[PDB]
Structures are given as structure tokens and as C-alpha cells.
């Protein structure tokens, strides 16, 4: 049972709307159950709100969907509307402490770090809770997310790295696609082909790795043939230090997860 | 059907095509579902040439009396129709790769003037039970290889240092793999739905003054999009070399 | 309403000259005499605009602090916020920041500004009528205004460094400097055009141009390869970085 | 005159849609239907646009051969020049090379063309009125194709790559992508403008925007460290070498 | 030594390796050897309830947790630990950080081991506070001894020995992995070039260690003028081979000082 509980989100962003339209195909609460608010109307199939302070006074489970530079300023005006609700947090960096720091210790705060995919029921949900949230809580939280995707529990300390590769990793996943059909419409394919071509290469490759009982190296080494073509790309790869730039730019982001939560 | 040669990719191959519901030949027997065979030669068969490049010449000049309008399919990277034509004589090219042994391969292929529709039926419907198949021009070939062919070596490196990235950084090694799997295969289903072209999705997930910015930032500086056309390229200029 | 550039240098002129030539509304003042403005003795002499360099501003405003009693004070001053602008003359002040651009010489000018409490509407709507005059004003955050004038303010600079080394390639490699300069304006001309009325992205715009084993796909590669992207988020990332040392 | 688009792709449909807007002058064939244009059952069904990849362009143009008799074919292939053209349709032929871009689509763009032995002052005078109903079109030597492609051609794909980090940028620093693409797009409408109707040189322009410890110098520093002239130009040359190698 | 009880505090990669490499060498009965984790292992360890039990049925304790964690579990285990031998293998975590998590009073031994020991050719190198003496030191040596070869080095050379005989393997490890790529991608079997590769390094090995040329002139033995070896290593030194191993080693050595702060 979850159909009877009323969902709010405070702003419906590019994570917002993702995250909202996301709950909303998995139909696990009912229609007229899910919220929202925003400076602007936005094109969407959920009820609009005239504030966030009767979002949360009327809503059960209020998800901050805003970004964290204005998230202090929302969650003050929402902060005497909290009592007995249940508080879920979006916002990137913005950890437990800064949260209970805006809100008060006495709620019941739960940061859950999510990525777009959600849209298409695909998305990818890491997440913590405080002194406060207990397994009924969490039993809504885990059916929420898992209905548009696969929700794991994890340390606070361990949240920063996790966005950077769950949150901020779809990015890194567009730009792979979006090189790769490059480097194809360059050499003589078409754009559609290139993509087809990419898309299903990655498909497969993700599909290995999940029901191989091979590592991903031995994967990857199974694939280049003795004096062959992928010997010669990965060479490249190794030139251009592809291992590096990837993990550089996962701790890079990292670290600004870290420093928004100072 | 009969493979030549069962290595990496003609085990891959052979294995793809029996879990979709088949004979072969190596110096070596295999750990293999598929009937062994005396040699190459034995005349008993459609042919798969899934032997290495460079001993392909001397494999299919044995074969080449026994190939009497008997349908000859070659996976050999960089070796041509016309490379082809002049190993057997006056012949479909199929580029595969290793993920049809789940059922989820990525073909590409190209035939001669001696391959019909009713030699092509079949080829579309024996790797399209285990894949995707594409026919393409011969000049084309290479440059779908590169990124069809070796394609998942350069998605196994992305997915290894996505998750050496998440170790270093607290992650166990599990749930690195866990999140990243997903997040890949989330990213990818958005592609394919989306009405918005690739960039745009890339441009969604970037919040002002966020932390993906500064991911998508570090990339730029490293120059990660060089970096995976620079080794499709590098691919794809091997495949032409093979092929001259 | 009668406005006083203090300061008539290569942004005050372009400012003032600006303006001067929408014909909605002048009087200036400078250590030396520069315009069809009207000279005036000094600063202290009676909307007054800053035009001097941020260095020199602190004094210059702290000498007109007792004549600026309900009078609209715009800084154009870059990295000095509203912070280190009441610090200068007073809190009880009607202080507003606008970052502006050479741009607005030829009338077609990029405008960012942010205002202090003192500045109410009809202050701002004078504000906003002076600068759309003369080209695009946009009220943003004080927070926003270091990445807005790192954008908007230093631009052009970019800009013309672009046009300068698309003009030189065009050059090397046998055009005249003159047909050069031609063909890469209206190329940029044209360019901007696409952006601002397709309903298309600017990345898709750019798949477009980009012929299956042609041309455009070799010269994009090779912006791939010295980090073409990189270079122009570093310079305006580090321009940013400078407006806000200067802020602080 | 009837005018025939043999393809009506990215630059077929952007070319075909900038005239078809100016109303001065329509016909179209492609593998598939695709447009305000008539369609025709084939390239062979009777002055006629060559619109297709240049890899195909040689078959196409030989299928045409002896039905372009007193007719004017204007090419748009890249790489492919007049003799590479009279290699495909004889020498006896009236051809002209142009070369377009896609901004034309929205009535700017910009085009330079080249024209054999055949093509005479009448012929020239309808290609010029063609191409400045929806831009602007310069007659050039043919040695001077190459570069003129890489930049007017492929030019639109450096500007929107230069738009699209600059938005980049701005996203990155706290802006929304709607605020940084108005403040870009406003930035280089600007500079453009600054450029054609200044009497100072560009690196002058750029000069006046640098304030002595400013914030632009910084901006500008960065981009020297990145060599962000040499990457344009780097970029500019890799294209018009790959023009000449096509029409080798 | 047959008596005594020995514990492992977590199971993870090096705690098995450590646990079954000292199984393998027969010192410590089988069912005198214990192991804690939140979940069980594929081991033949004697699993056991809890830390706390561990602590007070074990004569010698091993702390095999990450460092992020030890500084709680060390917490746990701290007033079980009288009388008793703590072994710590945790990188970083020097005996000032040790004492300052469990107390000065107990028996403290900072022991840096590797992964190699699971085949008895474990690189080991230890430090130890006030309170461990010779008869202490002496279990120490011979528990490590059986699974490889142990040093007592100074408390200030830990940080730079981690860098080498503990992260050591790694590199090791990618410098084998790189071998076999340039053998695979130049026609050999992955398995040929494997086989020629371990050869190669366990030959070499050998002469460093029976040699009385230093290792620079046995490498210069091998360079034929004109060869092909000169060749092989000057495009090491374009690429600077020596400086990026030694980089590594540093960056390691740093991040075990960063930890041990
Ligand atoms: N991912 C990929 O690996 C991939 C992708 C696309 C295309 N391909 C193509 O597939 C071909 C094989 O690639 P691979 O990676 O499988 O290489 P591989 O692992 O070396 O496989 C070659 C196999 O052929 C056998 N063989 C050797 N000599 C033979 C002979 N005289 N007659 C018959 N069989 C013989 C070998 O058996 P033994 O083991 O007993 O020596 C070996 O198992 C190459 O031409 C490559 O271009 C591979
Ligand atoms: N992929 C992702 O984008 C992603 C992934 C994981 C986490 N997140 C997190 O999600 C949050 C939002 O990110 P985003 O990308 O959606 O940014 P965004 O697109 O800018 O979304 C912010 C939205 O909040 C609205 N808003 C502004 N002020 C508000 C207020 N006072 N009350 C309620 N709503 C207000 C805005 O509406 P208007 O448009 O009308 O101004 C805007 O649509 C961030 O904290 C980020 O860390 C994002
Ligand atoms: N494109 C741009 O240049 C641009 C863009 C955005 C913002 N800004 C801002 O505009 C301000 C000025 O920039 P700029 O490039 O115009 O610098 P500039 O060319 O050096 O102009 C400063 C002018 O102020 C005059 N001046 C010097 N001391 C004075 C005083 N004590 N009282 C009154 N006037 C005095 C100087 O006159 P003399 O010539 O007689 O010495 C000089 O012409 C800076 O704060 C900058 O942040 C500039
Ligand atoms: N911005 C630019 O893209 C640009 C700028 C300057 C010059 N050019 C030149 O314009 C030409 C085409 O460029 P593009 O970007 O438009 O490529 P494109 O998008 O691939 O357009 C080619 C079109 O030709 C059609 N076609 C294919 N085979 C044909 C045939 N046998 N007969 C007639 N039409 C056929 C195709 O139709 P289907 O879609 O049905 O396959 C396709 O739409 C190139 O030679 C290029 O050098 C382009
Ligand atoms: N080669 C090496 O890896 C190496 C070399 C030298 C030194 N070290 C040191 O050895 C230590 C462990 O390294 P590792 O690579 O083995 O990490 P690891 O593979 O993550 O092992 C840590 C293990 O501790 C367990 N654990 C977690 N919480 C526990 C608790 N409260 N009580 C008891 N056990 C708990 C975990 O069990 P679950 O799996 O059930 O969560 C995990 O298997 C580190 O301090 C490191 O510095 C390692
Ligand atoms: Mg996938
Ligand atoms: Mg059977
Ligand atoms: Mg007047
Ligand atoms: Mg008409
Ligand atoms: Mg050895």
C-alpha cells in the first residue's frame, strides 16, 4: 500500500520533472496523489500547488527537488510544516548535517541521490537517512525509487563518490555515445547507423559483464586478437590516458560533491 | 553450419547461435556444445572462417575446392571481399562481436556479387537470433568494425575505470560495478527513447553551478571525446592496412 | 533625468555614446578632456554612473558620499559588489550594478545588473529603459553577476579573438585579409541566427553541418584535439575566478 | 528558371528552404521523399543543384551526363572541383562550383563560387541573384575554394562548438542554459556588428575591452596558455587540407 | 606455537590472503585460527560471534578492516585486549594513531604484509610500540616467516615500505598486465605472452639477487651496441618509465602519510 499517500515536489527541474514523470509511469501512488510547485507552471500530468508551505502541509513525503544554493531558503519556509513527514532530499552535496542544519534535528530526513534514467524507469538511486527515518520509512522510500529503477543504502561518507558516479554518470555515458558516433560519422557512416551501431555495442558489452562470472579486464581481453584491430584502439586509449581522464573526472566531482557539503 | 576455427569470438559466435535454437574444426578440441570435426576440408557443409588474419590465406586455400556454391561467411578482421575473392576465387564479410554469446551481438556486413537475397535471408536470420545485423557498403566496414567490432573493448575500459574510480574514492568494488552497470544501461535506454538528441540529455543532468559541471569539465581538459574518436581512427586505420 | 558619466574611457565613451545616439535622454567627467558630452569641473559637481577602474573607485566614490542623497548611483565596476559598493558610499544609498559591453557603442549592447534594497521599481524601470535603449539588459542575482560579466562583460574579447584567428587561418592559406574578415562575419552572422530562431539545439546544428566523411568533421576533430571546449570554459571560468578576488 | 536539388539532406533541404523563402524563383529528388519542394522521379527527369555526398557524386553526375546539354550545373560537393566536375560530366558542360552554408536556411548565408570555361556573365548573373536572396555570395578563384570552404563552409560548426562551450561555461559558474545562451548570443551580435561598422582593426577592439588589471585580461590570459588561436587556425587548416585531399 | 589462538578481525582480500597463508604453512593448528565478519566467508577459519569474542578468546588479534572503520572496532575490542598481542595491518593507521584508538597500555605491532602471502611469498615489514618485547617479537617473526620474509624496520620507514612491499604488487601486477598486451597485440597468444613475460621477470629477479653487479650494469650486460634492447630502453626514457614508477611510489607514500596524520 502506497496509493494513499500524498508525494510533493518543491520544483520540477530537469531532475524534478525526471524524478516526478519517473513515480508517475510506475504507477505505484495514485494521480491525483502526486504534487508539485514551482515559480512557473510547468508542462506536466501532476497537481500544481500555490507554495511549497502548503505543499508540505498537505503532502506526506516531501522531496526537495531544488537546487542547493536556494535549497536553505526553501526548506526555512517548509521547516514548522515538517512534523511527522517525511523530508527526502535531492539536492547535490547537501549532506545530513546541512540538512538537519536547515531544518531541524527533530525531522525525518533521508538524502537520496538519484539520475535521469528514472524517467524511463531505468534510474540508478543511492541513499542515507537520519537518526530519525525507521524501516517504515525506508520501506517507502525503497518502493518509491525501485518502482523506476534499483535504490541501494549506503554510508554518508560514501554519498559523494556515489554521485559523481551514479548522479553525475549519465553525462559521462552521453559524452562516451556521443563520441563514438562522432568518430563513426567522420570515417563514412551515417548518424542514425553510428548510433544503432553504439548503442547496441554497449548494450551487449553492459549485458557481459552482468552474467559473465569473467571480470571486465578478462572481458576486454577476450575481445583483442593476437595482432589485431582492438589491439590498435586500445593502444590509443592507453596513449591518450582513457583510464585516467574517466577517473579524473569521477574524483574531480567528487570533490565538489565535498565541498558544496562544507 | 560450421565454424573454422573456435577461439574468442568463434566460440562467442558458435555459442550465440545454439542457445538461440553446428559443427567445427581447431588444432585443439574445445570445451564446446558444438560436433567436432575431422579438419577443414571435410565438404560436409554454410562456412564460418573465424580464424586469425594472418593464417586465414593458407586455412581457406584448403577449403577452396570444397566451397562448390556452398555459402562461405568470413569474420576475419580487415581481410576484404576483394582479399577474399582472391584467397577462395570469384562470399559474405560478417563483422560480429563477442556479446551475441548473450543473444546481444552487433553485426555488420557486405557481400559479392555472387551472394543473392536467398543467401542474405539466411544471413540476417542466423544473427539476428543472436544480435542485430546491418548491411553495409565494403568502404564502410572499417570504420564499423572499429566501433561495432571493438567496440565492447572500449565500453569494458569505461566500465573498469568507472568502477577504479569509485573504489579509490570509498566504493567497494561490487557496488561500484552495481551503480555503474546501471547508470550505463539507464543512459543508454534514454538515448533510444528520447526525442532530444544525445546532447541535449547530456545538457539536462548538468544543474547551474553543479557537480556534474565539474565531471563534464574534467573531461573536456583530459580531452575524452579526442580520446574515444582518436581509437576508433587508430582501429579503423588497422582494419584498411589488414585490408590492403 | 540628467546622467553624469564619472569616468570617459573606452567603456565610459562606449556607454555614453551609447545612449547618446538612442535618443531617450549628458554630462562627464575625467582627469582630461575627452565626446559630445557635456564637460563638467569634477565628480562632486551635480542618475550618476561609475565608469572609473576599480582600483581608483574607492576614493572616487567616497568623495561624492554627501551628494548622493536620493540620487541613482549605477556602478559599472567590475568585480565591486554591492557589498564593497556600500562599503564605498553608505548603505542608505540607492545603489544598482550593471555590468555593460562595448557592444552597446553600435546600440547593440549585453546588459546584466543587480540592485540593493534602496533601488524600488520605478528606479529600476529607468534602469532598464536606459540600457534596452542601446541593446539587451537582464536583472540577474549579485550572486551570478562574477560568470554573467565573465560571459556578457569580457565576451567580446573572446569574440574577437575568434574572428582574429579565423581571419588569420583564411590568410595563411591564400585568402585576402579583407575577404577573409568578410566571409567569417556573416559565416558568425549566420550562425547566431540559426541558434536564436531553430527549434533545434546548438549541438544539433552543429551534427547538421557535418557531412558523413567530409570536411567539417576533420576541422571539428581537430577542436577536439586541442581541447577547444576546455579553452573557452577555462577563460571564462578564469575571468570568473577574478571577478570574485576582486569582490572579496 | 526551374531549379532541380539532385538531394535534399542537411544541405540540400537548408540551401532548397533559403530560396524557396526569398521568393524569386522548384524540384527535388532523393532515395526517399522528404518539403514545400515538388518531387521528381528521378535525377534524370529534366538550371540543376548537385546536392549529394561527394563519394556518390560520381556516379550521379554520369547518369545526368547527356541530359545536361545548354543546362547550368551548380555543385555544391565539397572537395570535388570544376576538374574533378568536368571529369564527371564532360568539359563541354556549363559548371560552377559553389559553396554554401546552412545559416542560408534562415535567409544568411554565405557562399563562394568558382565557374569553367562555359558559364558566361548571363549564367553567373543568375547564380548571383540565387544566393543573395538568402545571403551573400562572392566570386573567387578556384585555388581559393579549399579555404573558403573551411571557413564559410565549415565555419557554422566552429561557432556553434564556440556558442555551445560559452554556454557551457556560464552553466558551470551558477547561470541557467536559457540566461547563457541570451547573454551569448547577445555577446557575439555585438562583436560582429562592432567589427564591420569600426574603423579600428579587430585586435584594436580587443584592446579597448582589456582594462588594465582587469578582469578580461585574465580571461584573454587563459586563452594564450590554451594556444586558443593556434586550435582555430589548427582547425581551419585540417579542413581545407582535407578539401584538397578529396579533390586530388 | 601449536597452542596459541590467532583472529582475524574482517575477511576481506588481504585478511583471507594473510589467514590462509599462514593455514598453508602448518604453524597454528587449524582450529586454533578464528575470523570475524558482518557476513561469513568461504573459509577455513573457525568463524566466530563477534570482535568482543574474538578479543577475549584470542591470544593474538589481527585488525584486517579497512581504516575508515578500524578506529570503531578497535573501540569495541578495547577493554578485552589485556595481556593480549594486537597485530595491525591497516595502511596508514601508524602506532601514535593505534594507541590513540585502543590505549598505549596494550600490546601493539603495526605489520604491513601483501597479498603474495597467500602463496607463501608474502613481503612483510613491521614496527612495534613500548609494551611488545622479544618473546612478543618472536611470535611476530615466526607467524610471517612461514609465509614469507618479515622486517623490523623503523616506525617513520613504514609509510615509504606500504608504498613498495604493500602497494607493491600492483604494480607489479599492471607491469605483467602491460607486458602480455604488447605481446598480444604484436601476434602472440595471450598465454605465450604470459609464459615468456613471468620467465623473463623471475630470471631477472634472480640475477639481482646472485649477482655482484649492481642491478644498472646487468642491465647494461644485456644492451648490445647497436641492438635491439638500447632501442627498447631509450623509449623508456622518453616516456619516462623510471620517473612514473617512482611517482607511484611517492603518491602512495604521501597518501599513507595523509592517513597516518
Ligand atoms: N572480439 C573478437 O575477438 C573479435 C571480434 C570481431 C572479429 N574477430 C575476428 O575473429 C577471428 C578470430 O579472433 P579471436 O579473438 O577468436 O582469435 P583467437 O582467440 O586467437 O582464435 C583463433 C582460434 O583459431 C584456432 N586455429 C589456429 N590455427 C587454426 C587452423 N589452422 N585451422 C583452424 N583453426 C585454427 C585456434 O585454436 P587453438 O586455441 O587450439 O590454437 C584459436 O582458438 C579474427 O580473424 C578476428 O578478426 C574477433
Ligand atoms: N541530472 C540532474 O540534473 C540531477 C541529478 C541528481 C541530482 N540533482 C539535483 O536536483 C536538484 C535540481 O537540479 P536540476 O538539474 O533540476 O536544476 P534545475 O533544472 O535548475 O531545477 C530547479 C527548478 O526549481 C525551480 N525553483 C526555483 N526556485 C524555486 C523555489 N523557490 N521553490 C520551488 N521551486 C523552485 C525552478 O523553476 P523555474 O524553471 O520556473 O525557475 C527550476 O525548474 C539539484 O539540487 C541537483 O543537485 C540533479
Ligand atoms: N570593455 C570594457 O573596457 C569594460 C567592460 C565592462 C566593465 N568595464 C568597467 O569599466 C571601468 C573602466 O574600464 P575602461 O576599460 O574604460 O578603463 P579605462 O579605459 O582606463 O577608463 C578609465 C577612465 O577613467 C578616467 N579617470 C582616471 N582617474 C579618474 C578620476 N580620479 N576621476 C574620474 N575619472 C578618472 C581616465 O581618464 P584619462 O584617460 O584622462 O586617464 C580613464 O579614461 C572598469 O571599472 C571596468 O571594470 C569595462
Ligand atoms: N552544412 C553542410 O552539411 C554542407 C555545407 C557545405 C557543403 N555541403 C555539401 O553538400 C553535400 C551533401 O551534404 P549533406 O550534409 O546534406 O549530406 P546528407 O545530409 O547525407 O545529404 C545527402 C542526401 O542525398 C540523398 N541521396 C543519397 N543517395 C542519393 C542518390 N543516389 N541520388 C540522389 N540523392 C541521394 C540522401 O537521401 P536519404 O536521406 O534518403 O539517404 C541524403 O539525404 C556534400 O557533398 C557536402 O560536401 C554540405
Ligand atoms: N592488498 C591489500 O588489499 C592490502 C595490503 C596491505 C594492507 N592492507 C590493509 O588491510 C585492510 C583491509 O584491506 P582489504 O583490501 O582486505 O579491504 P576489503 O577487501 O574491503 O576487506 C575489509 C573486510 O572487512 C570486513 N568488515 C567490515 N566491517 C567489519 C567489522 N565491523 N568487523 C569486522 N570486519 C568487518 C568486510 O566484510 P564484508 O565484505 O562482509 O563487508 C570486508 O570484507 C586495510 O586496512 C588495508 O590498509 C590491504
Ligand atoms: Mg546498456
Ligand atoms: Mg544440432
Ligand atoms: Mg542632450
Ligand atoms: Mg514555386
Ligand atoms: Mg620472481
Not at 532530499?89 to 536547515?102: A, T
Not at 552521453?174 to 560519422?185: H, M, P, R, T
Amino acid at each position: 500500500g502506497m496509493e494513499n499517500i500524498k508525494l510533493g515536489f518543491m520544483g520540477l527541474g530537469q531532475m524534478g520533472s525526471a524524478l516526478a514523470h519517473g513515480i508517475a509511469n510506475a504507477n505505484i501512488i495514485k494521480k491525483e496523489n502526486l504534487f508539485y510547485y514551482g515559480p512557473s507552471k510547468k508542462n506536466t500530468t501532476l497537481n500544481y500547488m500555490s507554495s511549497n508551505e502548503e505543499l508540505a502541509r498537505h503532502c506526506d513525503i516531501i522531496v526537495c527537488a531544488v537546487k542547493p544554493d536556494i535549497a536553505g531558503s526553501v526548506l526555512n519556509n517548509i521547516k514548522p510544516y515538517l512534523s511527522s513527514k517525511l523530508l527526502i532530499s535531492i539536492c547535490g552535496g547537501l549532506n545530513i548535517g546541512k540538512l538537519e542544519e536547515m531544518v531541524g534535528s527533530e525531522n525525518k530526513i533521508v538524502w537520496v541521490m538519484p539520475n535521469t534514467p528514472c524517467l524511463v524507469g531505468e534510474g540508478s538511486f543511492i541513499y542515507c537517512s537520519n537518526k530519525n527515518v525507521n524501516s517504515t520509512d525506508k520501506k517507502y522510500v525503497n518502493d518509491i525509487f525501485n518502482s523506476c529503477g534499483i535504490i541501494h543504502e549506503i554510508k554518508e561518507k560514501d554519498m559523494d563518490i556515489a554521485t559523481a558516479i551514479s548522479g553525475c554518470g549519465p553525462a559521462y555515458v552521453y559524452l562516451f555515445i556521443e563520441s563514438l558516433i562522432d568518430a563513426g560519422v567522420k570515417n563514412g557512416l551515417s548518424r542514425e547507423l553510428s548510433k544503432n551501431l553504439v548503442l547496441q555495442t554497449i548494450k551487449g558489452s553492459v549485458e557481459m559483464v552482468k552474467k559473465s562470472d569473467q571480470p571486465v579486464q578478462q572481458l576486454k581481453d577476450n575481445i583483442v586478437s593476437p595482432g589485431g584491430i582492438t589491439a590498435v584502439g586500445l593502444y590509443s586509449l592507453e596513449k591518450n590516458s582513457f583510464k585516467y581522464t574517466v577517473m579524473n573526472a569521477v574524483e574531480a566531482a567528487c570533490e565538489k560533491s565535498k565541498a558544496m557539503g562544507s
